[PDB]
Amino acid sequence: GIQGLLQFIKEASEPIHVRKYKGQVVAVDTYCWLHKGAIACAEKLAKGEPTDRYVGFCMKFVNMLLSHGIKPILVFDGCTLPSKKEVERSRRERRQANLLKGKQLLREGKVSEARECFTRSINITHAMAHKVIKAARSQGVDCLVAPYEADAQLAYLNKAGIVQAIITEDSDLLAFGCKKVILKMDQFGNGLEIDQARLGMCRQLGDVFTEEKFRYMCILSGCDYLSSLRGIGLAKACKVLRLANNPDIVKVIKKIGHYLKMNITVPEDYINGFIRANNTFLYQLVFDPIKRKLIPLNAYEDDVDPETLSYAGQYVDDSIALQIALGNKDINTFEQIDDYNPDTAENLYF
DNA sequence: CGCTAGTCGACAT
DNA sequence: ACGACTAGCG
Ligand SMILES: [Ca+2]
Ligand SMILES: [Ca+2]
Ligand SMILES: [Mg+2]
Ligand SMILES: [Mg+2]
Ligand SMILES: [Mg+2]
């Protein structure tokens, strides 16, 4: 999630209702709904007590989309991305920190802060995700567990034409090149749509409305695959690109100290880190539901060697990928928690 | 004055 | 895997 990205391109956003896509198909970043629903039962989840509320909290949104005549596809986060290892590690450590801070120092001190610390230590497991999957499937709703980050999977489904819109609360989806992104959607179906084509309607952006340039902006503003330089947020990220007359991004990143009149000594780790982040946004491994194959988000260009993109996701066998995608194989422990098969028992597969 | 990083409440009841 | 509010810096 990029800080201040909403306001920056506010002019490319319009308030809609889900009924706009009646008869059409939307894909959902379900982990957001899960994180939002687990809040109402953070205590039981922190203390390891059995709870089943988040499932209902997802199924009500599902029932709403279904009621307004939408075909939803629920996409789930899968294996942890190596390029995102640092950020995810940070989230892990913060989760453990809040978990301890509540569980021990608030069970005997003050109980009012206990729920607050518990809510800051919520960790969406694949088990819970599988509860939601079981429910949705029982109500006839297709599901898909991304090989890695659901961002890339959703972006793929939109760019491939399988879905026309994507429901999420994560603004990262734009940097991935999604056509339409529905944000901040409430219980009844009122949210903020963001069309990619409308990005040109933003004063502050300038000529940074193209996919590549917008991607660059998002990356060097600060993301989950690479932290920004100190003192550089969205505005200066945009200004650098606006003032850049040179097509090559590397030379620009090198002369970033000259463009902004700031004292910036750019390291090489930030250069190669930038290349890594770009390659992550471009070719992160997703799952093709039709062909049942693990593919890069975009087809590999001429200036990229696939053997060096280990951080963008590891290739596994197509059968293993298919089993992960069906939610049969647990992400954390790699065991067959289920044996669901789509061929037996107009779906995504076949 | 524009802008960035960092804190703390809402997130959903 | 959030965002309003703002103190402080260039
Ligand atoms: Ca409408
Ligand atoms: Ca895997
Ligand atoms: Mg993010
Ligand atoms: Mg995500
Ligand atoms: Mg993201």
Side-chain angles (χ1 to χ4, degrees), chain A residues 132-144:
Chain A
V132 178
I133 288 176
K134 275 190 174 184
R137 296 264 198 76
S138 64
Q139 285 200 1
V141 178
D142 288 330
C143 290
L144 207 171

Side-chain angles (χ1 to χ4, degrees), chain A residues 81-89 91 149 224-225:
Chain A
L81 195 63
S83 189
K84 201 180 167 188
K85 190 175 180 179
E86 184 178 7
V87 174
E88 283 181 329
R89 194 204 92 267
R91 294 178 186 172
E149 212 168 351
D224 286 334
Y225 313 141

